[model samples]
Target: KIFKPEELRQALMPTLEALYRQDPESLPFRQPVDPQLLGIPDYFDIVKNPMDLSTIKRKLDTGQYQEPWQYVDDVWLMFNNAWLYNRKTSRVYKFCSKLAEVFEQEIDPVMQSL
Candidate 1:
C-alpha cells in the first residue's frame, strides 16, 4: 500500500534526523549503514593511498555507471540513487516509483541476456 504524504513525512523525518546525528560510537544498527555502502568504495580507494575526493566524485558523477551495450546499469544507477533519497514531499515517492518501474521493465530483458 502507498503511504500517505503525512505518514511518509512522519516515518522519514526522525530517521533523517537520526542519520544526520549519528556518531561513530553510536553503534545503533549492527549492520553497516547506508554511508558505508555508498562511501566505502571511495573510502577504501582513498585509503589505499590518499586519492582526491574530486577524482572519486569525478568517477561517480562523470562516468555513467552503465555498460555501453546495455541499459541495465543506467537504470540500476538511477534506482540506487532513489533508494538513498530523503523526502519532504510526496513527489519524491512518485519520482522514485518511476525509477522502480523502469527497473522492473528492464530486469527481465537484462536478466535473460545474462
Candidate 2:
C-alpha cells in the first residue's frame, strides 16, 4: 500500500533531523567538494529539496510510481551517493544499511503494509 506525503514526512523527520544534526564536518559536503557535474544520482534531486507531500501524493495517485520503499530507499541512496562521491570507503554500506534498519524498525510497521 502507498502512503501519503504527511505519513512519509512524519516517518522521515526524525532521521532527517538527525542527519542534519550530525556534525557537518564529518560529512562529505564539509570537505573540499568536487561536485559531480554530470550523471548526478536521481536521489539527490529529492534529498536536496524540501519534499512537498502534496506533490508526492499527486505522483503516487497517478499509479505510475510503485516503489514501496521509495522514501526510505531514496533517503539511503542520497547518503550513499554522497559517500560514493566522497570516496569514503568506510561505513558507506553500513550507514545505509543502518538507515534501512531504522525505517524497518520505526516506520515500516506503522506504514501501509504489503
Candidate 3:
C-alpha cells in the first residue's frame, strides 16, 4: 500500500530524530560531505554515490519517496558509504554499525505491522 503523506511523516521523522537522540556524535552523517573542507579529495572517486541524513530528511519532507522501502534503502546506502570509506576498525565504521542496528530496531518491527 502507498503511504499517506502524514503516515510517511509519522513513520520517518520519529526514527530520524531517534538517530540523533541516540547518537550525539552523529555529525559525520548529519550533513552532506564536504570533500574539499574534509580534505578527503578521493571521496567522490571511491564513493560513487553519497548520502546523508539531512538529505534523506529533506526528501522525506518533500514527499520524494513513494514507498517506505525507498527510505530504508537510503539509510542503508548511507551506512554502506561509511563502511566503504572507513575500515572496520575505524570509529566511524563501528558507530555506523551501531546506528544501523538501531535503525533496524526502530523500523523493522514497525514495517512488519504495516
Candidate 4:
C-alpha cells in the first residue's frame, strides 16, 4: 500500500537529514541512518578501495535489506559526476557503470512500482 504523506515524510526523514548533512545548500533541511534491514544506512560508503562487487551483489540479492532510492540516487550522482569530470581515468567509468548496475538491481523494482 502507498504510504500516507505523513508516513512517507516520517519514514524518509533520515534520508533527508543525511542529504542535508552532506549538502545543506542543496536540500536546506534534516534524521539518523536506519538501524535495521528494510532501512537505509545512516551513511553511504560510496567507495573505499573499491567495494567488494560480490559482497554488494549478495547484499542486494539477500532480500534482507531495503535501501532507499535516495541513497542510490546520491551515489549515482557522485559517481556520474566523478566520471564526467575525471575523464582521464578509466576506473571512473568502470566504477560508474558498476554503480549503475547496483542502482538497477537495488532501486529499479521499487521505482517501477511507484
Candidate with better TM-score, 1 vs 4 = 4
Error of 4 at 49 (Å): 22
Of the candidates shown, which would achieve the greatest lDDT relative to the real structure?
Answer: 3
Candidate order by decreasing lDDT: 3, 2, 4, 1
Model 3 TM-score, all chains together: 0.91
Model 4, span 19-83: residue lDDT tens? 22333222211121222552534324433222222332333344422444533554455545445
lDDT of 2 by residue, 1-114 (tens): 465655555555554444433443224322222226545455455445422223333444454234546655544454455544333445534544444455455555544542
Better of 1 and 2 by TM-score: 2
Which should have the higher lDDT, number 1 or number 2? 2
Better structure of 1 and 3 per lDDT: 3
Write down the lDDT of every candidate, Cα atoms only: 0.36, 0.45, 0.83, 0.40
Q: Listing every candidate in turn, what is its Cα RMSD in Å to the true structure after a full C-alpha superposition?
A: 16.6, 8.0, 1.3, 14.8
**Clash totals for all models, in order?**
0, 0, 0, 1
TM-score of each: 0.30, 0.41, 0.91, 0.34
Clashing pairs in 1: none
Which digits, one per residue and each the tens of the lDDT, describe model 1 over residues 1-114? 333444333333332233223343112221222446566454343232322212323333444223322233433443344344434344533554543554465445534443
What order do you get sorting by TM-score, best first? 3, 2, 4, 1
Off by over 4 Å in 1: 1-70
lDDT of candidate 3 over 69-100, digit per residue (tens): 88888989999999999889887888788778
